[PDB]
């Protein structure tokens, strides 16, 4: 029991870490994509002449 209970603890903690991994990967990815669009926006500007 308790051996496999601990293994399935590890499994559900692994699932939770997969959820955190989804959070990190996709949100940092789309955030850096927003930053790419920001350099398209905030860093492609015309003012002077």
């Amino acid at each position: 029991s308790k051996s496999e209970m601990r293994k399935e603890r590890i499994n559900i903690i692994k699932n939770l870490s997969n959820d955190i991994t989804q959070l990190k990967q996709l949100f940092i990815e789309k955030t850096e994509l927003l930053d790419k669009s920001s350099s398209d926006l905030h860093n492609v500007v015309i003012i002077e002449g």
Partner: peptide
């Protein structure tokens, strides 16, 4: 740092 829109210009 350096950007590609530099190279676009």
């Amino acid at each position: 740092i350096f950007t590609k829109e530099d190279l676009i210009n």
